Amino acid sequence: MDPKSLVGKHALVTGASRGIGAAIAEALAQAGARLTLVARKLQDLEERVERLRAWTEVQGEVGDVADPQAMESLVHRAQERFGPVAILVNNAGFVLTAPFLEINEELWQRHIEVNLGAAYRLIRLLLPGMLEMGWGRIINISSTAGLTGYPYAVPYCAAKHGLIGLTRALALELAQRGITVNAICPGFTDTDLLQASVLRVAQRTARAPEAVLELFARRNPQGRLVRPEEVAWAVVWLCSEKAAAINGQAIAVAGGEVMVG
Amino acid sequence: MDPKSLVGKHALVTGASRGIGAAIAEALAQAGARLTLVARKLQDLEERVERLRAWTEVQGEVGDVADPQAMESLVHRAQERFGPVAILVNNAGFVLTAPFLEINEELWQRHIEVNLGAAYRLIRLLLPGMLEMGWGRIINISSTAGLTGYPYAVPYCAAKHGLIGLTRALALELAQRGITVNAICPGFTDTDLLQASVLRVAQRTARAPEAVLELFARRNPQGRLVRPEEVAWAVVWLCSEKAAAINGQAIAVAGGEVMVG
Amino acid sequence: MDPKSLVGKHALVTGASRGIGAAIAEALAQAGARLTLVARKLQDLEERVERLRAWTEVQGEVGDVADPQAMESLVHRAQERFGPVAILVNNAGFVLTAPFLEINEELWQRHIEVNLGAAYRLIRLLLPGMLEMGWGRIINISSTAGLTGYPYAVPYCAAKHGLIGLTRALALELAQRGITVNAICPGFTDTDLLQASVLRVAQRTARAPEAVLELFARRNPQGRLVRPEEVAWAVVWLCSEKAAAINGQAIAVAGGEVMVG
Amino acid sequence: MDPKSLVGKHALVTGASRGIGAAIAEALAQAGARLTLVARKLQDLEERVERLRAWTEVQGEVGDVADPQAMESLVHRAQERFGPVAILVNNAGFVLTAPFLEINEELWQRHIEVNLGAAYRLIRLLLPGMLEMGWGRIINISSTAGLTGYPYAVPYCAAKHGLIGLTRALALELAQRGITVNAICPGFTDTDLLQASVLRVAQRTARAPEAVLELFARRNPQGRLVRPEEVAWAVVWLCSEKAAAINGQAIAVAGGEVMVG
Amino acid sequence: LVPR
Numbered sequence A, B, C, D: 001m002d003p004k005s006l007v008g009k010h011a012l013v014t015g016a017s018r019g020i021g022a023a024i025a026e027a028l029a030q031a032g033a034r035l036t037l038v039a040r041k042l043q044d045l046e047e048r049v050e051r052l053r054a055w056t057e058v059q060g061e062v063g064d065v066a067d068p069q070a071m072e073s074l075v076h077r078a079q080e081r082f083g084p085v086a087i088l089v090n091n092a093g094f095v096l097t098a099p100f101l102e103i104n105e106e107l108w109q110r111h112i113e114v115n116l117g118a119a120y121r122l123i124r125l126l127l128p129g130m131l132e133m134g135w136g137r138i139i140n141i142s143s144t145a146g147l148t149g150y151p152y153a154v155p156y157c158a159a160k161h162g163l164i165g166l167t168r169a170l171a172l173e174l175a176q177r178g179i180t181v182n183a184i185c186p187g188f189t190d191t192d193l194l195q196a197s198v199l200r201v202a203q204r205t206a207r208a209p210e211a212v213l214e215l216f217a218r219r220n221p222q223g224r225l226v227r228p229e230e231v232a233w234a235v236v237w238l239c240s241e242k243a244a245a246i247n248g249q250a251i252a253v254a255g256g257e258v259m260v261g
Numbered sequence E: 001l002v003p004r
């Protein structure tokens, strides 16, 4: 990508304070896009906004993507300051692994609403602006669980696969409207949250954290975790005008764990 | 298949009064399975039960698969009469095509609950019986909308793709527990509901119903609609013990419209 | 199948003397099809023919499927005795696992000619007869290596994927000609050929053959090898007239190792 | 020049004088890679080399990729001038559409050798250099015919699917060796080669070339042909170190015609 | 949540 590629394009990213969302925001900022970063907590969001102001005009907003009323108000405030959103990156996730019979109606609904319902409601709010402008990019951060199954992750796989279905059908519906709809499907990514789970099980099984990291990296044929910057690289690539022919695709960022076709 | 293959196997089929569900019930009845047929209306359900009693012991139960309390009671009554369910065929569907922006929260939720949530709740209720027996078959009737996108059918594609995700993850979870979990994905099938829509468009465009049937059959490379019996043939094939190696699969019954891999 | 049995249908099966091919021939013989069994050696072929004559009219023919002149003559002799071939099961395979740089031009060509070229030439020879009759079934026995990659099996994966490509394009070309073209993709199957591949990789990775057998069965989520009868069950299912809507599909028989969609 | 990403990386591109190959060479030249451009004809290759010397050090070599002896010598000459090849883009293609029965052994072999065999031999020649350097990129330009079937293009689909199988297996084999192997699958692209295919099908189906061009653009949901720049954009994206996690993937560049997963 |  060029240094002044997405200049004058308002991009909104959810789950932006840390991990994958933070790296996506950083890659879009280095490309010149004006950013709206959405996160659940005030801590880490304001620090990310201050850091990314060195490259572009950045803004932060706190809100729960599951709450429709909170998002309807948040979207209005963000579009009032930086205009309509041209690039939307849906990066909200939730996974609680358990045997299928131990998943009650409430936990089933939470997986569906966070991983699929939130993206539906945000697209519904920002799509009129994209249609009015005649150009747009909707990028859904799904997972390898949206392309393949995992035991003990039935609700997560069902919701993430549903996000690929939403991606594919909407890509065809908006094909001749100047908007592309794509999904990026990362495998296990090296985030501060993952490093805490590695350190937790290492402290509980009397093992070194490096030995525990091997268990997480085992599914990746490259023998390592995916870096958040590698997920972000796939996102920024799609925002270019030369990526207009990329539509309805699920790009796996998992070292070969899932090989799409 | 053999004429006395599924003798002594209790099979429960939803959406059994007409179309695909009726053909599935007929094929399972000719194979010798004891049937519990679930449908929303009393009318065609009792007629189907009376017709299928010529081949096997049949039972009819009326209930809304979206209501959990109604299904919890229905399952208890059916298992009291014919014992635990060994074969579950989830065939509940709902589709209302519209532009994405014209899909309110209520309509979005209805697509998710009928096409995905109902299968989750019925599997949750009948899986303990299958685990106790050490053998079972969970067959989810999805659609080609679970494998590819269609414009103006975003919620239907999202829910049907979610049913493939549920299928895949649960197939891995139950792989060494004697149960196979598979999805059958029909394309446009020649049902009384579809024939009403073809006759409606023929009477609105001054065309013969045969010319309108060409538009519906256009996506099928074979130039015809899928027959309900062809969907049923794929269901009964999976119930055999020789189909134990078929697990986590999505079988498209669409003449080549979707070519799986 | 009893109501729509294969009586009066000439079926030709390659690699028929042992393993998957023998189980396919047995299933087709019990269904009433007249069989032409092709194999490289005379030894187990004539024993299989004598055993299967209890169910149907069987014929044995020896030949190398890689040699075009030998197959052109063999086909002529078989069609002279039992008329044109209605069902063709391409079950010729060859795999020699090695690092990519240790695969010379000769060995690369052998993988392409046995696993893909042989199916092309046999379809070219028998397709005019199927078109004349207005009905036919072409069933290509590929592998999970036709749907996913495996290290140290690059030429085998390339040739087996090519067979899926042949399957898909020809299914669309013959969609309205009464013929279905499908592929069955088994995982590791319990055969004498598998035992040779186990001993080969054990001698190359400094491991015991029992550890290699367990490693291959570990790829199958069901914790066991696929039975040849399970592959045969998927073949005979496709030959029914009720399986006319199954076209251009790749059916994985691998317990969930590969989940198609 | 500002984009200094692939500076000091020797990239070899086949089919580089015109169309997709020319756009790939242009994108790699603007990124700072030293280029070896291979084409069958001296015409247009020398002119492309002279034009691209404004951005980077370029070299032109004429040779038939089907001939192994000619390629073995060509590779030696190119590596003598610019050192070992770090990026290999296999963009050799050949398609002659016809009914399956009108494809003789010679024409079948030409499709296999040009679309699949040439990539195998070039990877075999350049992979030792990539392993020695500890870094590499193998990018196979396949097609939507490598992911789905097309009537009247059976040999092209078989060879292009085989190139995806080569891509997948080799990606796993080289996963921990610093090299990624991926395939880019364009749909109908606006090139001089496409105009020849349009004129060929028009002369064979008694239709005007304008009607054939519209029929091919109708398969693309975006209602237009893919631009060569769009295919090139997907190639250069993969060459970055931030695309190291993209391995064993097939990226469709077809507006949503094929939706990978 | 710092704006601007």
Ligand SMILES: [Mg+2]
Pocket (backbone or CB within 6 Å): A261, B259, B260, B261, C261, D259, D260, D261
């Ligand atoms: Mg597909």
Ligand SMILES: [Mg+2]
Pocket (backbone or CB within 6 Å): A259, B261, C259, C260, C261, D261
């Ligand atoms: Mg897959």
